[PDB]
Symmetry: C2
Subunit: 492 residues, 2 copies
């Protein structure tokens, strides 16, 4: 059968689940934790969240992590990817502000419990939760000096290396810098909600063509400094560090050679943006030729620290899009930073049919082939470095007007089928030379899905918010459980 | 060097309808530069006023004296069994003042009709290049020729010259090429300035460093495209017959990524674009390559919709002048780098020697030709897979034997041109390989039926398959290459 079996993959292969701090933790202002950009955004603009909710409680994992670890254990996961709340560790976001003991202890307890149970931690240092104190001091990642945020982020990473480096062997400095920059300062659907005048976001007094690039540049400088620090004082033979990129596969809209060029520019604007800098030390050629002065140059010293600043890389894959060419002409001018790719990303092809089957929410269309394309690109174009699919899954719609019955939410067969197909694609990719080494289902738990609030459940484990956030294994989780039971069965 | 007799191309390797011929250009072989009322050209002017810009300080006042010896040229073509002969028309020989009001020169019309008729008499099909770099000096002084900032005068004057050609030769000519190597013409004439009028950007070494190597080449190229579009429109609407065809020929050097980095693949891409796509894409889809627009920006003119419409599909066939290839190496956009020449807009260095230190192919003698037939195959695959697999003619292919005063080439050695024969045989063989791969190539023209004036190289290079003794009344002598071609076609 083509249904994935654990013996399809090497003994060393890794299978886990993933979450992020703001999305599952709760205890937003408990035990000294400082306010983050998201606490601020949700509390100030509930109307910018689909269901007007916030993650004050989320999945209450700050108090229920032991149940989280138990389920991970029961499912036989090899690893668990989670993030550290910058403001829970440093309430004022700086060294000056001081470290929060309860924050350090929370993560220390989680990490130790995971390891004791034989589950390897894959820690995301920054998963979009910027301490509000930094946002107010210098705009956080919008820091025009390119110094303040780099120093503050670097110290944050230092505190993580100092307090957890003896137990953590896998680090991810940043999660989806492209989504973060483009959504936060481009379309403004993410905190702080900035965008160009004329666009519909909470603060249409920004610049979608510039701020996303300013933020991205500071993120890359911060990543380079943190990795430099790591390699000089905390690096160990068995530890790895990198970052995770959000990536949607790209496929030519039509047959014209122009759509092939459009496709290339789209991989560039989405993946290339942050990938090429850590691979070779600079932005993709296409981006420098189109964004021009809006895309900052790197000093030679920065280019050096940037090139090769990873031991592994994560890819968060969910869907794909058809790329359609847009010619450079006097009748076209970019509005969003993503418009600099001179191509429109389409869900539907020229025949009026979606690239793949819709999975339920507004943007996820199933197209496993896209993942294979992505892996072949990493293999053939970017040196075939160690790759971990740090995120993959779907969100089941559940709203007040369209309630999702718990029994139906638990019988998540679409998610199961989707997960199985992507794991199968990983096997096909491996048989073609891909250096992929692990897979993480996104959302061990149903959680706060940013601007979607609680309208989408991505968990393999159901969280009953109506009843003390009690957890319930869904069919997907149960299949993963049997899948992980043994590396190599006997009889699959 | 020169291998296996079982590899030697045979005529039956190609379809009965395939076309094999030789090629020349007006200024290079005609001579009679000011005879029978012929007007002065940009090249007459350049060679006369700037002999130091020509390797041996020569000029083509006589060339191969084909204006008078064309009957012998036809004879040789006939003897070699050539199916066709590609030659060009001298704009100034037809229109001394390059304009309609300047009048048509009856002696010019006569000359070409005699050549064309004699060719057809001997069963040789004429392939006529309308413009082969010889602009009437009168137009150059009037508004700068293709530098016309109005983008109207030159288009009108060229369209009229084209009309005179269609009117007076269209009855016998069924194969037209509007322009020869537009990229070479624009870049060399206004970029590096090695070609007449010899303009370049201030601070650069050329006869007239008062131009702009980042704009003039594009202005000229833009006018050339508008001129081509107009001429083609005119042709289709008044001269096009079911059995006649029109197009143009592009100069093309193959491009191979320098190293294994994906960056060199992209550099190779931009290079094919700046060299070939610059003029190919406009005639294929009505606009310049995306890469060029993203890099040259406003230095690359926009087309009016009416023009994009006339440009798109303005050809029934396409010519490719192929001689060698280069390794393309990436150059990043940065505050430390600034383009100087229009060709620098491609952000890539063109290298002869690869990362292993070996030349892309064996040197053929002159300073730039390295034998790499595989590059021709790469080119035909691109044409087939990316640009609609249109009918293709290799309108130029060959090598130039160095023959200077310092190091004179013994005539006997000049005639035993085995290196050229080898090169010719290998590229023809490559056409057979490309055909088996789906290429829609329909013909091959060895460049230089005769040793001629090789532009800034003067007479230091002999590209002919037929030797021309300029010392003894420009007498012609068959070289080994010609003798093999004779056998090939028989």
């Amino acid at each position: 059968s083509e249904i994935p079996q654990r013996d399809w993959f090497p003994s060393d292969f890794t299978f886990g689940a993933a979450t992020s701090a703001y999305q599952i933790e709760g205890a937003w202002n408990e035990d000294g934790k400082g306010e983050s950009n998201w606490d601020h955004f949700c509390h100030n603009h509930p109307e910018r969240i689909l269901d007007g909710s916030n993650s004050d409680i989320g999945a209450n994992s700050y108090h229920m992590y032991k149940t989280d670890v138990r389920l991970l254990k029961e499912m036989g996961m090899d690893a668990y990817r989670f993030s550290i709340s910058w403001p829970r560790i440093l309430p004022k976001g700086t060294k000056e502000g001081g470290i929060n003991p309860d924050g350090i202890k929370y993560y220390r307890n989680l990490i130790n419990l995971l390891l004791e149970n034989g589950i390897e931690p894959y820690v995301t240092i920054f998963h979009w939760d910027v301490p509000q104190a930094l946002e107010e001091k210098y705009g956080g990642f919008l820091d025009k000096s390119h110094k303040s945020i780099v120093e503050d982020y670097t110290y944050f990473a230092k505190v993580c290396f100092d307090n957890f480096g003896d137990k953590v062997k896998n680090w991810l400095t940043f999660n989806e810098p492209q989504t973060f920059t483009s959504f936060s300062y481009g379309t403004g659907v993410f905190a702080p909600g900035r965008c160009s005048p004329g666009l519909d976001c909470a603060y249409p007094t920004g610049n979608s063509l510039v701020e996303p690039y300013t933020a991205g540049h500071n993120i890359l400088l911060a990543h380079a400094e943190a990795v430099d620090l790591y390699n000089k004082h905390y690096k160990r033979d068995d530890t790895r560090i990198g970052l995770a990129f959000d990536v949607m596969g790209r496929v030519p809209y039509g047959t014209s050679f122009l759509d092939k060029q459009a496709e290339e520019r789209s991989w560039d604007i989405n993946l290339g943006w942050f990938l090429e800098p850590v691979v070779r030390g600079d932005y993709p050629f296409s981006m420098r030729s189109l964004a021009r002065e809006r895309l900052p140059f790197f000093k030679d010293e920065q280019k050096e620290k940037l090139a090769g600043s990873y031991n592994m890389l994560g890819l968060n894959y969910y869907t794909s899009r058809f790329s359609k060419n847009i010619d450079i002409s006097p009748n076209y001018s970019p509005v969003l930073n993503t418009d600099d790719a001179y191509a429109s990303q389409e869900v539907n092809g020229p025949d009026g049919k979606p690239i793949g089957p819709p999975m339920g929410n507004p943007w996820i269309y199933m197209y496993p082939e896209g993942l294979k394309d992505l892996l072949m690109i990493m293999k053939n174009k970017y040196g075939n470095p160690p790759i971990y699919i740090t995120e993959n899954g779907i969100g089941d719609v559940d709203t007040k007007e369209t309630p999702l019955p718990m029994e139906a939410a638990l019988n998540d067969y679409k998610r199961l089928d989707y997960i199985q197909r992507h794991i199968a694609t990983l096997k096909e990719s491996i048989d073609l030379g891909s250096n992929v080494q692990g897979y993480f289902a996104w959302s061990l738990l149903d959680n706060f899905e940013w601007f979607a609030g609680f309208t989408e459940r991505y968990g393999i484990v159901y969280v009953d918010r109506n009843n003390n956030c009690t957890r319930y294994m869904k069919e997907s989780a149960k299949w993963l459980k049997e899948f992980n039971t043994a590396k190599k069965p006997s009889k699959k």
